């Protein structure tokens, strides 16, 4: 079918790749050089948004920020600057849960139906085709673009109404901080008590202290593994769009709030590209000790 | 073998009541009035605690803080002023990670062994013999207790050394209170975004962010079920510890140290004898807005 | 000499009625109306932007964010485009410190120069010419607008280089935000403890907890007199100012992060129009203790 | 008159030289040796607390914790082993405002009085009677012993009934530390934004940013002097009583907390021994840059 994809960054590229070796027909734009492999498989590079929306029924969307999606939608040469009666637009993008609502609203009364899922997963995740996609929007919209979430990831979730998929990532990212943040806390407590990093792991994994990240985050520690996966410069990005929404809806959220700090205290020891559970860097550094 | 229980009370009772429960001959001793039950079933409650150690290989002891474990041991009638020759001393309460390494080889130069064995899982758990419990000590004596410890609960780990047991709790109380501070956190403001906090939940259970907390503790914050499961005010006592280990240590345990002030405004209103989900409360008050 | 003052409004305004007062041509303008008193006064609204740049050496900023100061310099109808050659721009915003530094030197590059010179008062401060300046430039060009500054308040003070003016405003605004919190956190224990906070405010004031906040802001919260002075939703824009800052250099700024969250439990409940002597509120919820 | 005096440590032996020298009569005690120009003054050691107290009229105590307060009236030869009837016992430690409210009333009860005088000059306030004193009891009996406080201090003030002067000097502490950690974070931003910490310190001066700290400590820590004036060692001390009286108070004192984990960094980095001013050190290392 017409699908149209604006964004072909490390995670949009491998995506829309998915959907053309799918036999899917499609139309992209990005800022930038297009993947070989990408045209290879019949996507078409077209020059701006608005000639991908003329073409596609449904149009995906990747871009970094809250402006850029509104730039996308609203721009000079995007997607509204024609018509889009009938048509579908996916923002896959991480951007404020607040400006979506309004976003959607706008391209309703376009005549288009908007749905917001944001992914997480990273590079790898997209590439393989196992991203997590939380949605927001209508379920029969939802269901009409589900065979492609389908070739996208693998734990999709319509979440509710329009916003809510990116505030379900806002969330999921506030709670991966945090559980990355206490795993560090714990850890280098015990490590500096005189304990085995590696034995209370497994002690306080059969427990309440139980999480995927005690489980994944917490041997990166250990083994010292800090190879991207996920880069503490991003995580920045994602906590900066949970506190300004805190900002906005007048949040007090005293932990997201000092993981940002902590954040910031790994970038200024070069820890910006490394994975977020170097994290743990920061508080050896402030007990002067590591694992 | 012939064993000695010097704390009974809410957990030291149905523990002592289990051991006893097995066909082992106790002598038991503790300020209150010994439980019936466990009188009844063989228990001797010798008057005072010197009396313990002396018929007794294998001495229990469930005291409520560092000090009253200091004094159990080295007290006028303590385990002191008696032969400590050949005999096996295990404390499982939850006391100082520091202090518990001086207590060990001071009853270690006396000619007995020491496993302290801090445990979690509060009275529901000590009664139906499924107690976590994180060992310290030497394996062989580990191995020689390990008989008891099956009948005391379920997950057993030897976890290192005298010292290490404790350690390890601590551990699990910190992570506990920020994994359960994080979902508050996520959730207040998933809310007041206007997402469905059962939603978010059920999608964040399929990632990252999931937990062995947001599963139990984030279902208990939504149907608003905080009936103790776990005491706010206990796990308060619980990061004291942590704080004064850490202060001891010279850690910067920051969201330990929040978390520990969040309780504060908990018990400031009335939730202190709630369950440690009600931490939830704190962020909505912060907030102005619940669920 | 010939002036230009390129914004209006809640400060900018009476800052050009003033310098209309001393006898100087101003050419103003701004989006809303120019406020009666000082177009008869000599000053001419001349209807947009790259205008006042002709017709005056020295052009006065005062516009509200980082973005619309870039705007007013290099945008369609801004200061771009029209010769710059021998003139002297001051921006007077508070606005992003890292932002001033290569707005400046744009400016340089263009032929005029720079002062960045944030200012502290309100609206009040304004009126009556006593608000303080904090410069940042070269000491002949701030030596040249000297006089102006002397009409517009009392406290000028070059602080350094094009940048360091904007940067001064931030640290006044932690330091005040933060010792506004100190006496909240002190004054609430003081009063939950059962002491009189008259007497200890009193107390303290001989000594090294001595500030200008306890003196004036300790009484505004005894007396419970939050009529603005400087609203709290002001300070969050420029808590903001400073966090950004922070997380663009990479420091760790742990109590003006949390400051800032405690802002948004203000605004939650009715504090975002008072005063930010009003902070001490947000403890006393945290607390339920007022006083 | 006849004056004791229990605990001579660095403030205390240099309190009673300071009465000794004003020719009152003295028998003191302390844990150690007592110093030669004491003795040399009239000073008669004594060998208990118990002796002091029955020798004179009003009897000062200087000990480190609530615990030898608690010793030093009740233990097994200390004040009250002896009559108290018409005694005035003035507590000059710095110890928790609840158990004092307690020790007081108990003294009561003996027909004695109490007045709980907390001080803060440190070691050289105390050898040239400057000491800064809050008082906490009644009118009439601070009255009596005014002449006294006037040879050791230099402020003294009634702050209400007994425990209000803890109290007072729990709430100078928090301040105290808080300022110093403002101060650090203001002048590090600044200094990695590029602008002088001198300047700066001097702009803040005349606004709402000034206060003893900045004017006293801001130098410190430009001119890197950090020579013990009041050891950060002491101030965890403090801290320790803060957030312990918040905790039974059930206050949620966010700043104090993070302040005392700072004040662990230092302590991992050396900074135990330096003054407090070094805490300043904490936010360099954690942003990687020194002033």
Redesign the interface.
């Given at each position: 079918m017409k699908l149209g994809f604006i964004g072909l960054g490390i995670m949009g590229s491998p995506m829309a790749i998915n959907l053309a070796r799918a036999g899917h027909q499609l139309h992209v734009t990005t800022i930038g050089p297009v993947a070989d492999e990408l045209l290879s498989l019949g996507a078409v590079n077209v020059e701006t948004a608005r000639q991908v929306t003329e073409f596609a029924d449904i149009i995906f969307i990747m871009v970094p920020d809250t402006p850029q999606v509104e730039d996308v939608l609203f721009g000079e040469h995007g997607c509204a600057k024609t018509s889009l009666q009938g048509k579908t637009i996916v923002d896959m993008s991480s951007i404020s849960?607040?400006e979506t609502?309004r976003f959607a609203q706008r391209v309703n009364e376009m005549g288009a139906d908007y749905l917001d899922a944001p992914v997480?997963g990273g590079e790898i995740g997209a590439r393989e085709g196992t991203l997590?996609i939380?949605v927001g929007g209508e379920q029969k919209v939802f269901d009409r673009v589900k065979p492609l979430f389908d070739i996208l990831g693998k734990?999709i979730?319509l979440?509710?109404?329009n916003?809510?998929g990116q505030?379900?990532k806002?969330?999921?990212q506030?709670?991966?901080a945090?559980?990355i943040?206490?795993?560090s806390?714990?850890?280098?407590?015990?490590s500096?008590?005189?304990?085995?990093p590696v034995?209370?792991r497994?002690?306080?994994m059969?427990?309440?202290?139980?999480?995927?990240?005690?489980e994944?985050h917490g041997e990166r520690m250990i083994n010292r593994t800090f190879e991207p996966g996920f880069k503490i410069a991003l995580h920045?990005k994602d906590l900066?769009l949970?506190?300004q929404?805190?900002?906005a809806?007048?949040?007090?959220?005293?932990?997201?709030?000092?993981?940002?700090?902590?954040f910031?205290?790994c970038?200024?020891?070069g820890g910006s590209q490394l994975d977020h559970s170097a994290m743990v860097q920061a508080?050896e550094?402030?007990?002067?000790?590591k694992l």
């Open positions: 849960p607040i609502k997480s997590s939380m734990n979730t979440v509710g109404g916003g809510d505030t379900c806002v969330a999921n506030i709670i991966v945090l559980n943040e206490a795993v806390e714990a850890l280098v407590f015990a500096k008590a005189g304990a085995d034995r209370v497994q002690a306080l059969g427990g309440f202290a139980s999480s995927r990240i005690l994944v920045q900066n949970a506190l929404s805190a900002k809806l007048a949040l007090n959220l005293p932990n997201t709030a000092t993981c940002q700090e902590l910031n205290t970038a200024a020891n508080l550094l402030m007990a002067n000790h």
